[PDB]
Amino acid sequence: QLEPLPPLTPKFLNILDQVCIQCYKDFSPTIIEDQAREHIRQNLESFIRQDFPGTKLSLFGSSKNGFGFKQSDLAVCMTINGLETAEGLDCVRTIEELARVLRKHSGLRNILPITTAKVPIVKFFHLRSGLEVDISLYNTLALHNTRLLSAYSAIDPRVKYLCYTMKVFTKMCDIGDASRGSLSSYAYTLMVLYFLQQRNPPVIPVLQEICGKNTESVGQLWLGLLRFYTEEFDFKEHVISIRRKSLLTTIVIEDPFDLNHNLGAGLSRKMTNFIMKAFINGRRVFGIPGFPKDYPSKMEYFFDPDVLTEGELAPNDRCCRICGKIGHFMKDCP
Numbered sequence: 018q019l020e021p022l023p024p025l026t027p028k029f030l031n032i033l034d035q036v037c038i039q040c041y042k043d044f045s046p047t048i049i050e051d052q053a054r055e056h057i058r059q060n061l062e063s064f065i066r067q068d069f070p071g072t073k074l075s076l077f078g079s080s081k082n083g084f085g086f087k088q089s090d091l092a093v094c095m096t097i098n099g100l101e102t103a104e105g106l107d108c109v110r111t112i113e114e115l116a117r118v119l120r121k122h123s124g125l126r127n128i129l130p131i132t133t134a135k136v137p138i139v140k141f142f143h144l145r146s147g148l149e150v151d152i153s154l155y156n157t158l159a160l161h162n163t164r165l166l167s168a169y170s171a172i173d174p175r176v177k178y179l180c181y182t183m184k185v186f187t188k189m190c191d192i193g194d195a196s197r198g199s200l201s202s203y204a205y206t207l208m209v210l211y212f213l214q215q216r217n218p219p220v221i222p223v224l225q226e227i228c229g230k231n232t233e234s235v236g237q238l239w240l241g242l243l244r245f246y247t248e249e250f251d252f253k254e255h256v257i258s259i260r261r262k263s264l265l266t267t268i269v270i271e272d273p274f275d276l277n278h279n280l281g282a283g284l285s286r287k288m289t290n291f292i293m294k295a296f297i298n299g300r301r302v303f304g305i306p307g308f309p310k311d312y313p314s315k316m317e318y319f320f321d322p323d324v325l326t327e328g329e330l331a332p333n334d335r336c337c338r339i340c341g342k343i344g345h346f347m348k349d350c351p
Protein backbone atom coordinates (compact mmCIF):
# COMPACT_ATOMS: atom_id res chain seq x y z
CA GLN A 18 0.00 0.00 0.00
CA LEU A 19 1.04 3.61 -0.66
CA GLU A 20 1.14 6.72 1.49
CA PRO A 21 -1.80 9.07 0.80
CA LEU A 22 -1.07 12.33 -0.99
CA PRO A 23 -2.10 15.75 0.35
CA PRO A 24 -4.85 17.69 -1.45
CA LEU A 25 -4.05 19.55 -4.65
CA THR A 26 -3.86 23.32 -4.52
CA PRO A 27 -5.17 25.17 -7.61
CA LYS A 28 -1.76 26.84 -7.97
CA PHE A 29 0.34 23.66 -8.06
CA LEU A 30 -2.27 22.07 -10.34
CA ASN A 31 -1.90 25.00 -12.74
CA ILE A 32 1.85 24.29 -12.81
CA LEU A 33 1.30 20.60 -13.56
CA ASP A 34 -0.78 21.70 -16.54
CA GLN A 35 2.09 23.76 -17.97
CA VAL A 36 4.53 20.86 -17.53
CA CYS A 37 2.28 18.40 -19.36
CA ILE A 38 1.72 20.92 -22.17
CA GLN A 39 5.43 21.75 -22.36
CA CYS A 40 6.28 18.06 -22.80
CA TYR A 41 4.47 18.37 -26.14
CA LYS A 42 5.71 21.74 -27.42
CA ASP A 43 9.34 21.20 -26.39
CA PHE A 44 9.74 17.74 -27.93
CA SER A 45 7.27 17.37 -30.80
CA PRO A 46 8.72 18.12 -34.25
CA THR A 47 8.18 21.45 -35.95
CA ILE A 48 6.23 21.68 -39.19
CA ILE A 49 9.51 22.38 -41.02
CA GLU A 50 11.09 19.23 -39.58
CA ASP A 51 8.07 17.14 -40.57
CA GLN A 52 8.27 18.61 -44.07
CA ALA A 53 11.96 17.64 -44.02
CA ARG A 54 10.91 14.05 -43.30
CA GLU A 55 8.54 14.22 -46.28
CA HIS A 56 11.38 15.43 -48.52
CA ILE A 57 13.52 12.49 -47.37
CA ARG A 58 10.73 10.14 -48.43
CA GLN A 59 10.42 11.67 -51.91
CA ASN A 60 14.14 11.45 -52.67
CA LEU A 61 14.47 7.86 -51.44
CA GLU A 62 11.49 6.88 -53.60
CA SER A 63 13.12 8.30 -56.73
CA PHE A 64 16.46 6.70 -55.84
CA ILE A 65 14.99 3.22 -55.29
CA ARG A 66 12.81 3.54 -58.40
CA GLN A 67 15.97 3.18 -60.50
CA ASP A 68 16.32 -0.49 -59.48
CA PHE A 69 12.77 -1.26 -58.27
CA PRO A 70 10.43 0.44 -60.76
CA GLY A 71 7.01 1.23 -59.34
CA THR A 72 8.32 1.66 -55.79
CA LYS A 73 6.04 3.60 -53.45
CA LEU A 74 7.26 4.72 -50.02
CA SER A 75 5.08 5.75 -47.09
CA LEU A 76 5.97 7.02 -43.63
CA PHE A 77 4.49 5.30 -40.58
CA GLY A 78 5.30 4.99 -36.89
CA SER A 79 6.31 8.03 -34.87
CA SER A 80 6.74 10.03 -38.09
CA LYS A 81 2.96 10.04 -38.66
CA ASN A 82 1.11 8.83 -35.54
CA GLY A 83 1.19 12.29 -33.93
CA PHE A 84 3.36 11.31 -30.94
CA GLY A 85 6.90 11.28 -32.34
CA PHE A 86 9.90 13.16 -31.01
CA LYS A 87 12.59 15.07 -32.81
CA GLN A 88 15.36 12.64 -33.79
CA SER A 89 12.85 9.78 -33.78
CA ASP A 90 13.69 7.04 -36.25
CA LEU A 91 12.09 7.58 -39.65
CA ALA A 92 9.98 4.48 -40.41
CA VAL A 93 9.29 3.80 -44.09
CA CYS A 94 6.98 1.23 -45.69
CA MET A 95 7.90 0.06 -49.20
CA THR A 96 5.49 -1.35 -51.78
CA ILE A 97 5.85 -1.99 -55.51
CA ASN A 98 3.09 -1.07 -57.95
CA GLY A 99 1.66 -4.19 -59.55
CA LEU A 100 2.45 -6.19 -56.39
CA GLU A 101 -0.78 -5.86 -54.41
CA THR A 102 0.61 -7.96 -51.56
CA ALA A 103 3.80 -9.62 -50.36
CA GLU A 104 2.31 -13.06 -51.03
CA GLY A 105 5.01 -15.04 -52.81
CA LEU A 106 7.43 -12.10 -52.56
CA ASP A 107 10.85 -13.08 -51.21
CA CYS A 108 11.25 -10.28 -48.67
CA VAL A 109 14.71 -11.34 -47.45
CA ARG A 110 16.08 -11.36 -51.00
CA THR A 111 14.41 -8.02 -51.72
CA ILE A 112 15.74 -6.47 -48.50
CA GLU A 113 19.24 -7.76 -49.26
CA GLU A 114 19.16 -6.40 -52.82
CA LEU A 115 17.71 -3.11 -51.54
CA ALA A 116 20.63 -2.79 -49.12
CA ARG A 117 23.17 -3.09 -51.94
CA VAL A 118 21.27 -0.49 -53.99
CA LEU A 119 21.35 2.03 -51.14
CA ARG A 120 25.11 1.67 -50.54
CA LYS A 121 25.52 3.64 -53.79
CA HIS A 122 23.77 6.63 -52.15
CA SER A 123 26.30 9.32 -51.22
CA GLY A 124 24.15 10.72 -48.41
CA LEU A 125 23.69 7.47 -46.46
CA ARG A 126 25.98 5.61 -44.06
CA ASN A 127 26.01 2.27 -42.24
CA ILE A 128 23.67 0.36 -44.54
CA LEU A 129 22.48 -2.69 -42.62
CA PRO A 130 20.08 -5.42 -43.83
CA ILE A 131 18.43 -7.22 -40.90
CA THR A 132 16.53 -10.45 -41.55
CA THR A 133 16.59 -11.71 -37.95
CA ALA A 134 13.35 -10.19 -36.67
CA LYS A 135 9.80 -11.12 -37.64
CA VAL A 136 9.81 -8.42 -40.34
CA PRO A 137 13.06 -7.91 -42.30
CA ILE A 138 14.19 -4.29 -42.66
CA VAL A 139 16.98 -2.18 -44.12
CA LYS A 140 18.57 0.18 -41.59
CA PHE A 141 20.75 3.18 -42.40
CA PHE A 142 21.78 6.63 -41.19
CA HIS A 143 20.87 9.78 -43.12
CA LEU A 144 23.51 12.51 -42.98
CA ARG A 145 21.54 15.45 -44.39
CA SER A 146 19.24 15.18 -41.34
CA GLY A 147 20.96 13.01 -38.72
CA LEU A 148 18.11 10.48 -38.61
CA GLU A 149 18.18 6.70 -38.60
CA VAL A 150 15.89 5.25 -41.27
CA ASP A 151 14.17 1.86 -41.32
CA ILE A 152 12.66 0.57 -44.57
CA SER A 153 10.39 -2.48 -44.44
CA LEU A 154 8.31 -4.24 -47.08
CA TYR A 155 4.51 -4.18 -46.92
CA ASN A 156 4.18 -3.41 -43.20
CA THR A 157 0.45 -2.71 -43.26
CA LEU A 158 -0.34 -3.69 -39.67
CA ALA A 159 2.12 -0.97 -38.66
CA LEU A 160 0.33 1.57 -40.87
CA HIS A 161 -2.92 0.60 -39.12
CA ASN A 162 -1.56 1.23 -35.62
CA THR A 163 -0.49 4.61 -37.00
CA ARG A 164 -3.91 5.46 -38.44
CA LEU A 165 -5.55 4.37 -35.18
CA LEU A 166 -3.28 6.40 -32.88
CA SER A 167 -3.43 9.34 -35.29
CA ALA A 168 -7.23 9.27 -34.94
CA TYR A 169 -7.15 9.29 -31.13
CA SER A 170 -4.67 12.18 -31.07
CA ALA A 171 -7.09 14.36 -33.06
CA ILE A 172 -10.12 13.69 -30.83
CA ASP A 173 -8.92 15.76 -27.88
CA PRO A 174 -5.72 17.82 -27.41
CA ARG A 175 -5.31 16.23 -23.97
CA VAL A 176 -4.53 12.93 -25.73
CA LYS A 177 -1.35 14.34 -27.28
CA TYR A 178 -0.40 16.29 -24.15
CA LEU A 179 -0.56 13.09 -22.08
CA CYS A 180 1.12 10.76 -24.56
CA TYR A 181 4.03 13.20 -24.82
CA THR A 182 4.17 13.56 -21.03
CA MET A 183 4.24 9.77 -20.72
CA LYS A 184 6.93 9.65 -23.41
CA VAL A 185 9.13 12.14 -21.53
CA PHE A 186 8.54 10.35 -18.23
CA THR A 187 9.50 6.90 -19.53
CA LYS A 188 12.42 8.24 -21.58
CA MET A 189 13.77 10.04 -18.50
CA CYS A 190 13.40 6.93 -16.32
CA ASP A 191 15.25 4.83 -18.93
CA ILE A 192 12.34 2.38 -19.26
CA GLY A 193 11.11 3.26 -22.75
CA ASP A 194 13.35 1.27 -25.11
CA ALA A 195 12.16 -2.24 -25.96
CA SER A 196 15.47 -3.18 -27.61
CA ARG A 197 17.14 -2.94 -24.17
CA GLY A 198 14.64 -4.98 -22.12
CA SER A 199 11.94 -2.43 -21.25
CA LEU A 200 8.70 -1.43 -23.01
CA SER A 201 8.26 0.35 -26.33
CA SER A 202 6.85 3.83 -26.84
CA TYR A 203 3.81 2.19 -28.45
CA ALA A 204 3.10 0.18 -25.30
CA TYR A 205 3.17 3.20 -22.98
CA THR A 206 0.91 5.06 -25.41
CA LEU A 207 -1.65 2.24 -25.25
CA MET A 208 -1.54 2.52 -21.46
CA VAL A 209 -2.42 6.21 -21.86
CA LEU A 210 -5.33 5.67 -24.26
CA TYR A 211 -6.63 2.72 -22.24
CA PHE A 212 -6.61 4.87 -19.09
CA LEU A 213 -8.55 7.56 -20.96
CA GLN A 214 -11.13 5.04 -22.18
CA GLN A 215 -11.58 3.71 -18.63
CA ARG A 216 -11.67 7.15 -16.98
CA ASN A 217 -15.07 8.15 -15.60
CA PRO A 218 -16.31 10.05 -17.55
CA PRO A 219 -14.42 8.80 -20.62
CA VAL A 220 -12.02 11.15 -22.39
CA ILE A 221 -11.94 9.04 -25.57
CA PRO A 222 -14.21 6.31 -26.91
CA VAL A 223 -13.13 2.97 -28.36
CA LEU A 224 -12.96 3.77 -32.07
CA GLN A 225 -13.04 0.01 -32.77
CA GLU A 226 -16.73 -0.11 -31.73
CA ILE A 227 -18.16 2.82 -33.72
CA CYS A 228 -18.35 13.44 -26.29
CA GLY A 229 -15.99 15.87 -24.58
CA LYS A 230 -17.83 15.17 -21.32
CA ASN A 231 -14.62 14.88 -19.27
CA THR A 232 -13.57 18.36 -18.14
CA GLU A 233 -10.48 17.49 -16.09
CA SER A 234 -7.30 19.41 -16.83
CA VAL A 235 -4.26 17.66 -18.28
CA GLY A 236 -2.52 17.93 -14.91
CA GLN A 237 -5.37 16.14 -13.17
CA LEU A 238 -5.35 13.42 -15.84
CA TRP A 239 -1.57 12.93 -15.72
CA LEU A 240 -1.50 12.38 -11.96
CA GLY A 241 -4.71 10.40 -12.40
CA LEU A 242 -2.81 7.97 -14.61
CA LEU A 243 0.03 7.73 -12.09
CA ARG A 244 -2.46 6.92 -9.32
CA PHE A 245 -4.43 4.64 -11.66
CA TYR A 246 -1.52 2.32 -12.51
CA THR A 247 0.00 2.47 -9.00
CA GLU A 248 -3.07 1.95 -6.78
CA GLU A 249 -5.97 0.27 -8.61
CA PHE A 250 -5.09 -1.66 -11.76
CA ASP A 251 -4.71 -5.42 -11.28
CA PHE A 252 -1.85 -6.17 -13.66
CA LYS A 253 -2.54 -9.93 -13.90
CA GLU A 254 -6.33 -10.22 -13.74
CA HIS A 255 -6.99 -7.54 -16.38
CA VAL A 256 -5.43 -6.98 -19.81
CA ILE A 257 -4.63 -3.47 -21.00
CA SER A 258 -6.74 -3.51 -24.17
CA ILE A 259 -7.89 -0.35 -25.95
CA ARG A 260 -9.76 -2.68 -28.30
CA ARG A 261 -13.07 -2.45 -26.42
CA LYS A 262 -14.62 -0.95 -23.30
CA SER A 263 -15.38 -4.20 -21.46
CA LEU A 264 -12.58 -5.34 -19.16
CA LEU A 265 -10.60 -8.29 -20.53
CA THR A 266 -9.31 -11.07 -18.28
CA THR A 267 -6.02 -12.92 -18.68
CA ILE A 268 2.15 -6.51 -17.27
CA VAL A 269 0.06 -7.54 -20.29
CA ILE A 270 -0.74 -5.12 -23.13
CA GLU A 271 -2.75 -6.33 -26.12
CA ASP A 272 -2.02 -5.03 -29.60
CA PRO A 273 -5.30 -3.61 -30.99
CA PHE A 274 -4.92 -5.53 -34.29
CA ASP A 275 -2.58 -8.50 -33.69
CA LEU A 276 -4.58 -9.99 -30.83
CA ASN A 277 -1.85 -12.58 -30.15
CA HIS A 278 0.77 -9.83 -29.68
CA ASN A 279 1.41 -9.01 -26.02
CA LEU A 280 3.57 -5.88 -25.92
CA GLY A 281 4.76 -6.79 -22.41
CA ALA A 282 5.67 -10.35 -23.35
CA GLY A 283 9.43 -9.87 -23.10
CA LEU A 284 9.44 -8.19 -19.69
CA SER A 285 11.71 -9.45 -16.92
CA ARG A 286 10.65 -9.11 -13.26
CA LYS A 287 13.37 -6.78 -11.96
CA MET A 288 12.45 -4.54 -14.89
CA THR A 289 8.74 -4.89 -14.11
CA ASN A 290 9.60 -3.95 -10.52
CA PHE A 291 11.87 -1.16 -11.76
CA ILE A 292 9.09 0.25 -13.96
CA MET A 293 6.49 0.18 -11.19
CA LYS A 294 9.04 1.80 -8.88
CA ALA A 295 9.47 4.72 -11.28
CA PHE A 296 5.71 5.32 -11.43
CA ILE A 297 5.43 5.39 -7.64
CA ASN A 298 8.12 8.08 -7.54
CA GLY A 299 6.39 10.04 -10.29
CA ARG A 300 3.22 9.73 -8.22
CA ARG A 301 5.15 11.38 -5.38
CA VAL A 302 6.87 14.15 -7.36
CA PHE A 303 3.79 15.11 -9.40
CA GLY A 304 1.35 14.67 -6.51
CA ILE A 305 3.09 16.37 -3.58
CA PRO A 306 3.79 20.15 -3.82
CA GLY A 307 10.69 26.31 -2.29
CA PHE A 308 8.98 25.48 -5.58
CA PRO A 309 8.67 27.68 -7.84
CA LYS A 310 11.01 30.30 -6.33
CA ASP A 311 14.31 28.36 -6.27
CA TYR A 312 14.05 26.03 -9.29
CA PRO A 313 15.10 27.65 -12.60
CA SER A 314 13.56 24.87 -14.73
CA LYS A 315 10.38 22.98 -13.89
CA MET A 316 11.24 20.25 -16.40
CA GLU A 317 14.43 19.45 -14.49
CA TYR A 318 12.52 19.24 -11.19
CA PHE A 319 9.71 16.90 -12.26
CA PHE A 320 11.85 14.81 -14.63
CA ASP A 321 14.92 14.44 -12.41
CA PRO A 322 16.32 10.93 -13.10
CA ASP A 323 18.01 10.78 -9.68
CA VAL A 324 14.58 11.26 -8.06
CA LEU A 325 12.36 9.17 -10.34
CA THR A 326 14.69 6.15 -10.33
CA GLU A 327 16.83 6.98 -7.26
CA GLY A 328 20.12 7.23 -9.14
CA GLU A 329 19.84 3.66 -10.43
CA LEU A 330 20.29 2.38 -13.98
CA ALA A 331 17.72 0.30 -15.80
CA PRO A 332 18.42 -3.44 -15.36
CA ASN A 333 20.15 -5.00 -18.36
CA ASP A 334 20.84 -8.62 -17.41
CA ARG A 335 19.43 -9.84 -20.73
CA CYS A 336 21.61 -7.41 -22.64
CA CYS A 337 24.91 -7.79 -24.43
CA ARG A 338 27.50 -6.32 -22.06
CA ILE A 339 29.08 -4.58 -25.08
CA CYS A 340 26.12 -3.11 -26.99
CA GLY A 341 23.51 -3.23 -24.22
CA LYS A 342 20.76 -4.48 -26.55
CA ILE A 343 18.76 -7.69 -26.31
CA GLY A 344 18.51 -10.26 -29.10
CA HIS A 345 22.01 -11.75 -29.33
CA PHE A 346 24.76 -13.21 -27.17
CA MET A 347 28.13 -11.52 -26.69
CA LYS A 348 29.73 -13.42 -29.59
CA ASP A 349 27.64 -12.24 -32.57
CA CYS A 350 27.53 -8.51 -31.86
CA PRO A 351 28.52 -5.79 -34.38
Ligand SMILES: [Zn+2]
Nearest residue numbers: 337340341350
Ligand atom coordinates in the same frame (compact mmCIF):
# COMPACT_ATOMS: atom_id res chain seq x y z
ZN1 LIG B 1 25.50 -6.77 -28.51
